Write a protein that binds this DNA or RNA. Structure first.
Ligand SMILES: [Mg+2]
Ligand SMILES: [Mg+2]
Ligand SMILES: [Mg+2]
Ligand SMILES: [Mg+2]
Ligand SMILES: [Mg+2]
Ligand SMILES: [Mg+2]
Ligand SMILES: [Mg+2]
Ligand SMILES: [Mg+2]
Ligand SMILES: [Mg+2]
Ligand SMILES: [Mg+2]
Ligand SMILES: [Mg+2]
Ligand SMILES: [Mg+2]
Ligand SMILES: [Mg+2]
Ligand SMILES: [Mg+2]
Ligand SMILES: [Mg+2]
Ligand SMILES: [Mg+2]
Ligand SMILES: [Mg+2]
Ligand SMILES: [Mg+2]
Ligand SMILES: [Mg+2]
Ligand SMILES: [Mg+2]
Ligand SMILES: [Mg+2]
Ligand SMILES: [Mg+2]
Ligand SMILES: [Mg+2]
Ligand SMILES: [Mg+2]
Ligand SMILES: [Zn+2]
Lengths: 71, 111, 49
RNA sequence: ACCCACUCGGCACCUUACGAGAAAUCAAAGUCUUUGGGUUCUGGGGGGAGUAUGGUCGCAAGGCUGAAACUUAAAGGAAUUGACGGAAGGGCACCACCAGGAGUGGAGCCUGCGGCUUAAUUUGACUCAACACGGGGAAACUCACCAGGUCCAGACACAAUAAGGAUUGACAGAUUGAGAGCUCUUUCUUGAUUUUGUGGGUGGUGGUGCAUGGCCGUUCUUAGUUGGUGGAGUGAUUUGUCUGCUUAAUUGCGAUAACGAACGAGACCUUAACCUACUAAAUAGUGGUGCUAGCAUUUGCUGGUUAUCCACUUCUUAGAGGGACUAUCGGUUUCAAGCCGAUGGAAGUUUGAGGCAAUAACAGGUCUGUGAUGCCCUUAGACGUUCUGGGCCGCACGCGCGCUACACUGACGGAGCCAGCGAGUCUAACCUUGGCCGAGAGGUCUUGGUAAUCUUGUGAAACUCCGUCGUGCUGGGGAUAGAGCAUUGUAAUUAUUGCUCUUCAACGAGGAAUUCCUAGUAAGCGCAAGUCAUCAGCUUGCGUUGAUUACGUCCCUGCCCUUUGUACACACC
């Protein structure tokens, strides 16, 4: 046939980061727990799931994308 | 290879067939292709009595070195036909006459 | 070859004449999901703020 | 000089085979394992090699004598069957000719092939037997090619990572052809399904048809293949299976050390021709009758009316039978198979045309039909797969299949107006009548049909009739091109197709060559089906109109058969 060409730069995939993540909660002294990162009002998301904090943005990932809620 | 096909023909024939034909085509153990007819008895190849009296099957047998065709042909006895014609269109039978004891000047019977 | 081929048809007659004479777990499936449908099998509560 | 008989001794031939031989053959090549009349000579696998060496003869060329080392499993003889011949004798055939027909070859375009061009212009096939062939009419798909973008649909085993998360997804942004979280930014979500690594799979229109199956093409528009009892030979083998004659035919007659058979040809099957005989039919059709229209009227003539009734089966349909066997007679011939003529017959060229078709062969074609397949290749920056766009169509030009013409046996305009093979919509949008609107293409509202019921009597085309043009590249011819309107489709630009207007090319019958064809055939003519969303200048079938000329031969070409040669048999590649 021919076999290769490549003006270089091969593509990568993704890392799923690292993130020891859920420290995001808070406990006063013994024991009251105040949540952080407001949760989602979709009845599909059972208030366990939270939102992501960007510019303009609070975003549900449990909805794979769905429903921009902005505060 | 012959043990197989020569046995098949000997079972087909002892099953009361009118004739049988077996063809193996392919490659056994060599690089080149070969083929062997294996036949005993009577087969007809032409026209309509084909569709009536001969039963044909091909089979692909897949082996380490390649693939062989199997081709079988059985001529069923037209005498036993059950539902269908009882012989080939060739068959012309003449019914045999009687030895006669003639003469015996005329007279007559009465009842 | 022919002699061993003949004897093969002899063994194919043996098997042929011989075989011509010769010699519960119940409970189902959709019923077991109905029988185990007696529940105490779940949990639900959520949805504030 | 001749004739006839006998006898010696010659040169040979003929027939025999008791006999001999591996055979071919042999009155010796016989009287030989039942081995001895007398005598001379030569040979002891092939090659080395009649070479070296010595002797000897010769003017010489050379003659006589004449080794070994080494190498090697055959070399060789006769006969058999094949295959092949640029040997000879017979045949068969419109893929051969004869007599002729319609042509192709010239032109324009359609189309395949080469070539060139190209990012790619995917590929197979190259005499008959590659080139409107791969059912190959590719806008996406198809698709294999090219420019780029995703995806794993990487089974399974062990191992590594890791519930403090093995892994998945994503809004907006950036980015991208793109409303691909491709990637990146940001920080949610996901829960042991994946990931990473080896091993092993897997897919592939990647390679190999010269590794195979299967299918197909070709030999073959051919007539060949085999076995029983007998005959010949040690034997492989032969005869049967053949000079002639006949046939489309190893089809037969006949000749006969062969007799009598089987496969293949034939029979058989399918279709078109014939049935006032058989059984029937509101999904076919006729007459009578009502109901009824028009013209005439003396009754008449010409229609309307899926059931208002009666009867029929000629026509149409398809069941069962019938029918032809070259019959009758006569010519011709081994008075044989047959051939020819005439009468009759629906039918007498295998009745016409097809289907099926033995043994064998080819490195024919096909891995690009297949989830048939061996081996090789590749397997995540994929030759897997999908997605966007292009490309198979690219044009100095060579080849082939074709379509339309060069006109007056014609174009055009009115008008008459006649087929056959088909095919059509369920979990869907197929075949379309009719009514409107539109110059047309079309649009639009309804309608029958899963169909002998509706489209459809497919009112097809050539063709017939009455006019216009009047031989002038003319109103023959319609390429090229501009402009607009429609349809299919997500998409029409490189213009899918259709309409309207205009533009009005070449071509004034085609060199050398070469194809196809003998009766409802050739040719002229359309139609339906295949493909198909749209596209036939193609193909498979169909009917319409309907000839001229053979009914012979071997000149050409082709192949089949004998005889013959062979040192070929992996068979003249
Ligand atoms: Mg036949
Ligand atoms: Mg001629
Ligand atoms: Mg000519
Ligand atoms: Mg090739
Ligand atoms: Mg594409
Ligand atoms: Mg992703
Ligand atoms: Mg591997
Ligand atoms: Mg591997
Ligand atoms: Mg081949
Ligand atoms: Mg012919
Ligand atoms: Mg005879
Ligand atoms: Mg036969
Ligand atoms: Mg009738
Ligand atoms: Mg007559
Ligand atoms: Mg080849
Ligand atoms: Mg392959
Ligand atoms: Mg092409
Ligand atoms: Mg006209
Ligand atoms: Mg003009
Ligand atoms: Mg014109
Ligand atoms: Mg259609
Ligand atoms: Mg069509
Ligand atoms: Mg085609
Ligand atoms: Mg010979
Ligand atoms: Zn949510």
């Amino acid at each position: 046939k021919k076999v290769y060409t490549t003006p270089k730069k091969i593509k990568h995939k993704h890392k799923k980061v690292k993130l020891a993540v859920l420290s995001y909660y808070k406990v006063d002294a013994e024991g009251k727990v105040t949540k952080l990162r407001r949760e989602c009002s979709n009845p599909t998301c059972g208030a366990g799931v939270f939102l992501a904090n960007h510019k303009d943005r609070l975003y549900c990932g449990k909805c794979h994308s769905v429903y921009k809620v902005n505060a | 290879i012959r043990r197989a096909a020569y046995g098949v023909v000997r079972y087909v024939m002892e099953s009361g067939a009118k004739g049988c034909e077996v063809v193996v085509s392919g490659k056994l153990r060599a690089a080149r292709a070969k083929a062997m007819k294996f036949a005993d008895g009577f087969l007809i190849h032409s026209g309509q009595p084909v569709n009536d009296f001969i039963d044909t099957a091909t089979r692909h047998v897949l082996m380490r070195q390649g693939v062989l065709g199997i081709k079988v042909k059985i001529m069923r006895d037209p005498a036993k036909s059950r539902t269908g014609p009882k012989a080939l269109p060739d068959a012309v039978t003449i019914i045999e006459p009687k030895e006669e004891e003639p003469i015996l000047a005329p007279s007559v019977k009465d009842y | 070859a022919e002699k061993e081929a003949q004897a093969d048809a002899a063994a194919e007659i043996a098997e042929d004449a011989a075989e011509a004479e010769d010699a519960x777990x119940x409970x189902x499936x959709x019923x077991x999901x109905x029988x185990x449908x007696x529940x105490x099998x779940x949990x639900x509560x959520x949805x504030x703020x």
